[PDB]
Amino acid sequence: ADTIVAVELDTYPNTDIGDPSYPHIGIDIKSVRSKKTAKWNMQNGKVGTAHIIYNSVGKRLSAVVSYPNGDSATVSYDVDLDNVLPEWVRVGLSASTGLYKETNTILSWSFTSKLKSNSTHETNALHFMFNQFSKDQKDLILQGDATTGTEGNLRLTRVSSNGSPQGSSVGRALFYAPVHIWESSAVVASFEATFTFLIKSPDSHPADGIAFFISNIDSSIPSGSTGRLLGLFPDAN
Amino acid sequence: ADTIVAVELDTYPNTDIGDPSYPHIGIDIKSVRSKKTAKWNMQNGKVGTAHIIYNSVGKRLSAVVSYPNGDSATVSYDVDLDNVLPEWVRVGLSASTGLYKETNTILSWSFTSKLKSNSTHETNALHFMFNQFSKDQKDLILQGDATTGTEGNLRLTRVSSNGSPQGSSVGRALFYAPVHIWESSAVVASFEATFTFLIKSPDSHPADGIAFFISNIDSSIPSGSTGRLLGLFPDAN
Amino acid sequence: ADTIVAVELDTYPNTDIGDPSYPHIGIDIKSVRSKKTAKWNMQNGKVGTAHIIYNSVGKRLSAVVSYPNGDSATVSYDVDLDNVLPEWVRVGLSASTGLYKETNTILSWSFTSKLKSNSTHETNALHFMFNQFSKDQKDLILQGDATTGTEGNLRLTRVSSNGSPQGSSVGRALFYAPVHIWESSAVVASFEATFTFLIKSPDSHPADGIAFFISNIDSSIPSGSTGRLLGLFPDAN
Amino acid sequence: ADTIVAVELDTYPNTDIGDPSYPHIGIDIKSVRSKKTAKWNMQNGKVGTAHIIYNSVGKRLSAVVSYPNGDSATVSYDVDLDNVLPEWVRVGLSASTGLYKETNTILSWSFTSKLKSNSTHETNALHFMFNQFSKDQKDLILQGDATTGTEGNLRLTRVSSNGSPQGSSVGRALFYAPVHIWESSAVVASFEATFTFLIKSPDSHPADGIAFFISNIDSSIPSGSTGRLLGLFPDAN
Ligand SMILES: [Ca+2]
Ligand SMILES: [Ca+2]
Ligand SMILES: [Ca+2]
Ligand SMILES: [Ca+2]
Ligand SMILES: [Mn+2]
Ligand SMILES: [Mn+2]
Ligand SMILES: [Mn+2]
Ligand SMILES: [Mn+2]
């Protein structure tokens, strides 16, 4: 029922629903079967960094995941989001575990949206940046198992007392304010987001990954979207 | 019941409750009887501009109202907002009419909040800027008579069909997201806001003006705060 | 001798050197014969607005020119600027007249450059914004006939006393500070610029237009690059 | 000959020229004998963080030095910089050693200047942020012993091969572009800067500290301003 555009960091290859048989980043447009992907050397235990970028002039959504000192995977997909998203949306992060599991820690998150026309480069803008999460974060909507305060961190999926990931968990966090991503007079709309994540898995076969998603404002976790559906899509079509 | 800190643009001198007998800007801390004011040459029909500024190192809240080509009135008040506001607040604009009346148009509005510690100048930030208001502004909470879309403008108080101000009107608009204005580890918290307003009055004796206010997150118009109480305070104590 | 990447607003079609036989925007990479163009309805006398955007993940340089209420022309070109520009450059505007002429007024200009790695979305940044030009603008390098102060405006090419454009004129303006546009560790470098221009021509056959260009830091006007060479390139190859 | 406004981090108490007999931060206006100071618990070996802030409405210059987990010293001084600085200035950092010595490492630096009038909150702005210094930093003017590239760090004063501070050293670094700090129409001018520093001293009696200074654009090290004069002032009057 929801419209979802997402960039997925996928740590487990469900080949039966279109996954490359490796860890990959991907671009999803309304479906979990990514429109485009790229091989990703998931570095268990290391803190990574994901940048998403988009602007309506170029009409190309791009993403990069990089680890401190070395690797970057990267992926882009030309798409015009005017005819996909609604002009008001909410922005968030999502992650799930299933049979196998991993921590899905978000250590920081920032987003910037601009609607520019001409009028001497005049704008509408939203910007937020958490470089630390409070135990009482009144400006995040937490959904599912998502919790905060865990060392100043956003724990998207459930973790037991000692610091071990639990299975079939699904959490999401959305910024509280609606976002006006597109508008018909805007000669250039654009956005870009970054978050630093730490994925850790003991059972060295992690699952399921994390996603940054833009949705219709009233989105909530579809029934039975733990594991391979990333808490985003209600089926795998 | 609400905690309010506000900067008031007061167009009508209610001397019986502590007003200088002229148009003034003022700084209110929990009371409508301003802690500090300054004479203001209200320029009926002209578009003005107000800048509010604060930072917890200097502990001095300041405001300026200026009209295109010429006048600025200005006012500051040393106050430590740690021991006044709650650490989560909502930010908004407010305006009312009473026996006499004026249009209370807001043409644009922007706000920026930062919580900085050290860690190589690292931050938490919120920022929004409307340079035009939509007819369906999903990120403003409108209270009272406040409406949008009126030529891309925020009409804080009621105006009849032809463009004439109505009496005893009270509207408010608050940004949708809670704001974390203060936090105990922040070595410097700070904020600053600007809005451009157009006040017009036919009955050349305008009232009551406009205010930018920070409140507890769940604030709403106190009963019978039209006219001299600016839709902010429930009594005049 | 110079390396130039530029986006040209071309008001006069020199078909003999590869121009579409109409007003066009274009993307130049080291040559005046654009790599890509788009038809442009030059609106003599109206103030227009140009946005340039680039980021090294998508590797696509895009531009839009829009006039207040209505038209936008737009153009993009996938190019990897790592292997074109030097990692330190200067940024500027350029414009020329020749046999025919036009005013080449810049009313405002802003630019933003970021070099991001990971390290929790940490950056290097430069940003400037002139919304008005001083008569003594110590942070612009003016070259050729370029002058400031003309009503708070940057007059790229020569204009006589009464406000009439002169022929075979060439001016350029560059921001004073070198800019570090690219660096080998940056997992995402990006920039974007906007300027509002007012072109006016009495002899209703205007020439030669305006360009935003990135060059090696020590660039200066090539000999005899008035008219169709926009003060950018020394020949038309 | 130079006009200097500076905030000094002073690690060595020269009581004979007006120092409190302890490590202090201070505000200097044209003289090394600070207008105002505050006790500072210099934490040898730890990375500290300094925030300077100013805006022309409040007319109060403030500074904070804080160390990770714990201490902050703080100091403010009401001063109107319109009648002190020239409207074009350069901004920089400075540090010196003398008989005793310390490393004077700058690990990052950022600055933001705005000239706002009304016109719906419209601006002129400069902003730069180095979160790492290059070996070939084309946008810094280095003066005296100041060098870069030293682990991605700005080494304001001379350090020998193994990492030991040398005596009677004086370095300065200024951002390349002139800065327009004040202008007569600005209804609010404002600036703010941050840098992270690491001071280390083996001879546990460190000297002389570091300063952030605004000067006339053509400033250079006064003769014999090593040690207690911080490379800023030519005498101690
Ligand atoms: Ca999967
Ligand atoms: Ca009143
Ligand atoms: Ca041409
Ligand atoms: Ca001293
Ligand atoms: Mn996948
Ligand atoms: Mn009052
Ligand atoms: Mn051309
Ligand atoms: Mn001192």
Side-chain angles (χ1 to χ4, degrees):
Chain A
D2 298 327
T3 291
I4 298 276
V5 165
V7 170
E8 60 168 65
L9 274 49
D10 194 341
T11 52
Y12 189 92
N14 311 99
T15 72
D16 56 294
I17 54 167
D19 275 8
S21 59
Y22 43 66
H24 54 272
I25 55 188
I27 290 186
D28 306 351
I29 308 295
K30 274 177 294 181
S31 169
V32 75
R33 295 162 180 275
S34 326
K35 299 288 159 220
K36 189 74 164 307
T37 54
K39 195 169 162 299
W40 179 40
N41 295 156
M42 191 287 235
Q43 242 166 262
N44 162 44
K46 298 275 103 95
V47 186
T49 303
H51 302 275
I52 292 93
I53 314 158
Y54 179 78
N55 78 99
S56 64
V57 190
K59 298 184 180 316
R60 177 189 285 251
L61 169 51
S62 318
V64 220
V65 188
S66 53
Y67 273 107
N69 302 348
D71 271 46
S72 66
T74 206
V75 65
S76 328
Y77 184 69
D78 294 63
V79 63
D80 180 22
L81 292 173
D82 310 340
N83 351 293
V84 179
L85 288 173
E87 75 173 332
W88 292 93
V89 293
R90 263 200 170 101
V91 303
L93 298 173
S94 188
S96 71
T97 57
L99 233 183
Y100 302 91
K101 58 262 176 40
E102 46 170 37
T103 70
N104 293 134
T105 324
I106 303 303
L107 280 48
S108 80
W109 182 25
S110 71
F111 178 81
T112 292
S113 161
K114 306 233 196 71
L115 283 179
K116 310 191 216 74
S117 282
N118 27 46
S119 313
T120 297
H121 55 71
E122 282 320 282
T123 336
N124 284 33
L126 176 79
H127 178 53
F128 61 84
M129 165 184 43
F130 315 100
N131 274 344
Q132 199 199 153
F133 296 85
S134 165
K135 185 160 253 93
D136 188 21
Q137 196 70 35
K138 301 203 171 296
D139 54 3
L140 289 195
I141 294 167
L142 303 176
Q143 303 181 331
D145 302 327
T147 65
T148 59
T150 329
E151 300 179 0
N153 287 338
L154 169 64
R155 299 289 180 180
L156 278 185
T157 52
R158 173 152 301 162
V159 63
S160 51
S161 46
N162 62 273
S164 283
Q166 312 279 271
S168 0
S169 179
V170 58
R172 310 203 306 187
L174 301 78
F175 184 71
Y176 203 99
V179 175
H180 203 191
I181 33 84
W182 126 56
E183 193 269 307
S184 325
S185 311
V187 353
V188 39
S190 61
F191 68 81
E192 53 117 293
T194 309
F195 52 103
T196 28
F197 58 96
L198 196 176
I199 288 159
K200 231 184 290 188
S201 186
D203 51 69
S204 301
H205 216 337
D208 273 275
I210 308 177
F212 167 85
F213 75 98
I214 298 122
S215 69
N216 47 290
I217 52 177
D218 60 313
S219 197
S220 40
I221 310 182
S223 298
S225 44
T226 60
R228 42 98 161 279
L229 299 173
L230 275 31
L232 254 46
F233 316 88
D235 52 63
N237 298 103
Chain B
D2 298 327
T3 291
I4 297 276
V5 166
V7 169
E8 58 169 66
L9 275 49
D10 194 341
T11 54
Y12 189 92
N14 311 98
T15 72
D16 57 293
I17 54 168
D19 275 7
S21 57
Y22 43 67
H24 54 272
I25 55 188
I27 289 183
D28 306 351
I29 308 295
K30 274 177 294 183
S31 169
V32 74
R33 296 162 179 276
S34 326
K35 299 289 158 220
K36 189 73 165 307
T37 53
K39 194 170 162 298
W40 180 41
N41 296 156
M42 191 286 232
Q43 242 167 262
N44 164 44
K46 298 276 102 95
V47 185
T49 304
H51 302 277
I52 292 92
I53 314 158
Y54 179 78
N55 78 100
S56 65
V57 190
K59 298 183 180 316
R60 175 188 286 250
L61 168 52
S62 317
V64 219
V65 187
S66 54
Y67 274 107
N69 303 347
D71 270 46
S72 66
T74 206
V75 65
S76 329
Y77 184 69
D78 295 63
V79 63
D80 180 22
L81 292 172
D82 310 340
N83 352 293
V84 178
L85 289 172
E87 74 174 333
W88 292 94
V89 293
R90 263 200 171 99
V91 300
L93 299 172
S94 188
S96 72
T97 57
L99 232 184
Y100 301 92
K101 58 263 175 40
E102 46 171 36
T103 69
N104 293 132
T105 324
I106 302 302
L107 280 48
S108 80
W109 184 25
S110 72
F111 178 79
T112 293
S113 161
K114 306 234 197 70
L115 283 179
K116 309 191 216 75
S117 282
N118 27 46
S119 313
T120 297
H121 56 71
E122 282 320 282
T123 337
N124 284 33
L126 175 79
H127 179 52
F128 60 84
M129 165 182 45
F130 314 101
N131 273 344
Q132 198 199 154
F133 297 85
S134 165
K135 186 160 253 93
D136 188 22
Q137 196 70 36
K138 301 203 172 296
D139 54 1
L140 289 194
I141 295 166
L142 304 175
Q143 302 181 330
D145 300 329
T147 65
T148 59
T150 329
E151 300 180 0
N153 287 338
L154 168 64
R155 299 289 180 180
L156 278 184
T157 51
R158 173 152 300 162
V159 63
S160 51
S161 46
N162 61 274
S164 283
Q166 312 279 270
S168 0
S169 179
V170 58
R172 311 202 306 186
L174 300 79
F175 183 71
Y176 203 100
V179 175
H180 204 192
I181 32 84
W182 126 55
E183 193 268 307
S184 324
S185 312
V187 354
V188 40
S190 61
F191 68 81
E192 53 116 294
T194 309
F195 52 102
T196 28
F197 58 95
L198 196 174
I199 287 158
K200 231 184 291 188
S201 188
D203 52 69
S204 301
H205 217 336
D208 273 275
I210 306 180
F212 167 84
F213 75 97
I214 297 122
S215 70
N216 46 291
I217 52 177
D218 60 314
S219 196
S220 39
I221 310 182
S223 298
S225 44
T226 62
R228 42 97 161 278
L229 299 173
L230 276 30
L232 255 45
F233 316 87
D235 52 63
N237 298 103
Chain C
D2 298 326
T3 292
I4 298 276
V5 165
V7 169
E8 59 169 64
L9 275 49
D10 194 341
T11 54
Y12 189 92
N14 310 99
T15 72
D16 57 293
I17 55 168
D19 274 7
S21 58
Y22 43 66
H24 54 271
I25 55 188
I27 290 183
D28 306 350
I29 308 295
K30 275 177 293 182
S31 168
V32 75
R33 296 161 180 276
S34 325
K35 298 289 159 221
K36 189 73 164 307
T37 53
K39 194 169 162 298
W40 180 41
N41 295 154
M42 192 286 234
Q43 242 166 261
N44 164 44
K46 297 276 102 95
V47 186
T49 304
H51 302 277
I52 292 93
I53 314 157
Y54 179 77
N55 78 98
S56 66
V57 189
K59 298 183 180 316
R60 176 188 285 251
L61 170 52
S62 318
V64 220
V65 187
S66 54
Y67 274 108
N69 303 347
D71 271 46
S72 67
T74 207
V75 66
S76 329
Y77 184 69
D78 294 64
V79 62
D80 180 23
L81 291 171
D82 310 340
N83 352 294
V84 179
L85 288 172
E87 74 173 334
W88 292 94
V89 293
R90 264 200 171 100
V91 301
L93 299 173
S94 188
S96 72
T97 58
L99 232 183
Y100 301 91
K101 58 263 176 40
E102 46 172 36
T103 69
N104 294 133
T105 324
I106 303 303
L107 281 47
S108 81
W109 183 26
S110 73
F111 179 78
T112 293
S113 161
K114 306 235 197 70
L115 283 179
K116 310 190 216 74
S117 282
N118 27 45
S119 313
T120 297
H121 55 71
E122 282 320 282
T123 337
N124 284 33
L126 175 79
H127 179 53
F128 61 84
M129 165 183 45
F130 314 99
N131 274 345
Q132 197 199 154
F133 296 85
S134 166
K135 185 160 253 93
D136 188 22
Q137 196 69 37
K138 300 202 173 297
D139 53 1
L140 290 193
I141 294 166
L142 303 176
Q143 301 181 331
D145 301 328
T147 65
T148 59
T150 329
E151 300 180 0
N153 288 337
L154 169 62
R155 299 289 180 180
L156 278 184
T157 51
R158 173 152 300 163
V159 64
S160 51
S161 46
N162 61 273
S164 282
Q166 313 278 270
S168 359
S169 178
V170 58
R172 310 202 307 186
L174 299 79
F175 184 71
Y176 203 100
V179 174
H180 204 192
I181 32 85
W182 126 55
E183 193 268 308
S184 325
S185 312
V187 354
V188 39
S190 60
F191 67 82
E192 53 117 293
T194 309
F195 53 103
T196 28
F197 58 96
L198 197 174
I199 288 159
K200 230 184 291 188
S201 188
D203 51 69
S204 301
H205 217 337
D208 273 275
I210 306 180
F212 167 85
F213 75 97
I214 298 122
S215 71
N216 47 290
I217 52 176
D218 60 314
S219 196
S220 39
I221 309 181
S223 298
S225 44
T226 62
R228 43 97 162 278
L229 298 172
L230 275 31
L232 255 46
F233 316 88
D235 53 63
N237 298 103
Chain D
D2 298 327
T3 291
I4 297 277
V5 165
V7 169
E8 59 169 66
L9 275 49
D10 194 342
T11 53
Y12 189 91
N14 311 98
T15 72
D16 56 294
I17 54 167
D19 275 7
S21 60
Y22 43 67
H24 54 272
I25 55 189
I27 290 185
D28 306 351
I29 308 295
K30 275 177 294 181
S31 168
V32 75
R33 295 162 180 275
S34 324
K35 299 289 159 220
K36 190 74 165 307
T37 54
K39 195 169 161 299
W40 180 40
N41 295 156
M42 192 287 235
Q43 241 166 262
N44 162 44
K46 298 275 103 95
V47 186
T49 304
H51 303 276
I52 292 93
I53 313 158
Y54 179 79
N55 79 97
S56 63
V57 190
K59 297 183 181 316
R60 176 188 286 250
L61 169 51
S62 319
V64 220
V65 187
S66 53
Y67 274 107
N69 304 347
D71 270 46
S72 67
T74 206
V75 65
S76 328
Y77 184 69
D78 294 64
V79 63
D80 181 22
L81 292 173
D82 310 339
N83 351 293
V84 179
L85 289 172
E87 75 173 333
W88 292 95
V89 293
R90 262 200 171 101
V91 302
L93 299 172
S94 188
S96 71
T97 57
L99 232 183
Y100 302 90
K101 58 263 176 39
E102 46 170 36
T103 70
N104 294 131
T105 326
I106 302 304
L107 280 48
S108 80
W109 183 24
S110 72
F111 179 80
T112 293
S113 161
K114 305 234 196 71
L115 284 179
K116 309 190 217 74
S117 282
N118 27 45
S119 313
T120 296
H121 55 71
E122 282 320 282
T123 336
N124 283 33
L126 176 78
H127 179 52
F128 61 84
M129 166 184 44
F130 314 99
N131 274 344
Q132 199 199 152
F133 296 85
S134 165
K135 185 160 253 93
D136 188 21
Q137 196 70 36
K138 300 203 172 296
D139 53 3
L140 289 195
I141 295 167
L142 305 174
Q143 303 181 330
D145 302 328
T147 66
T148 59
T150 329
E151 300 180 0
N153 287 338
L154 167 65
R155 299 289 180 180
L156 279 184
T157 52
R158 173 152 300 162
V159 64
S160 51
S161 46
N162 62 273
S164 283
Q166 313 278 271
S168 359
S169 179
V170 57
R172 311 202 306 186
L174 301 77
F175 184 71
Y176 203 99
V179 175
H180 203 192
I181 33 83
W182 125 55
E183 194 268 307
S184 325
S185 311
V187 354
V188 39
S190 61
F191 68 81
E192 54 116 292
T194 309
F195 52 103
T196 28
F197 58 96
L198 197 175
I199 287 159
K200 231 184 291 188
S201 187
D203 51 69
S204 301
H205 217 336
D208 273 275
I210 305 181
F212 167 84
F213 75 97
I214 297 123
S215 69
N216 47 291
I217 53 176
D218 60 314
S219 197
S220 40
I221 309 181
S223 298
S225 44
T226 60
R228 42 97 161 279
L229 299 173
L230 276 30
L232 255 46
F233 316 89
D235 53 62
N237 298 103

